[PDB]
Amino acid sequence: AMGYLMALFEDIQAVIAEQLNVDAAQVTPEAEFVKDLGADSLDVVELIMALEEKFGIEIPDEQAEKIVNVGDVVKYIEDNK
């Protein structure tokens, strides 16, 4: 598990890193897209669509709208296959 959880977390960590132009180090489970990563309302939408496609999942808006830190999206990704 953990080994796979770390693998998954990294997966997502890298996607966020290249996308927002921030170092992986700053992309921690608890860091925040807006507050700490300089992202914006649409930045996150681009990110959600990318992750949705990559993993073949559909994150309901009721869930998406609650994403603040990267740990949030990691969990929502499991909550869908």
19 Cβ partners below 8 Å, 6+ apart? Answer: 43, 46, 47, 50
Resolution in A for the shown PDB structure? 2.6
- For residues 72 and 66, the answer to whether their CB atoms sit within 8 Å is yes
Which residue in 40, 43, 72, 79 is the catalytic one?
40
- For residues 71 and 30, the answer to whether their CB atoms sit within 8 Å is yes
- For residues 47 and 16, the answer to whether their CB atoms sit within 8 Å is yes
What Rg value do the Cα atoms of the chain yield, rounded? 12
Please say if 72 is a catalytic residue. no
d(CA 42, CA 28): 21
d(CA 24, CA 79): 24
- From residue 15, give the alpha-carbon distance in Å to each of 4, 51, 62, 73: 17, 8, 22, 12
Q: Which DSSP string corresponds to 28-81?
A: -TT-BTTTTT---HHHHHHHHHHHHHHHT----HHHHTT--BHHHHHHHHHT--
What residue ranges do the domains of the chain occupy?
A: 1-81
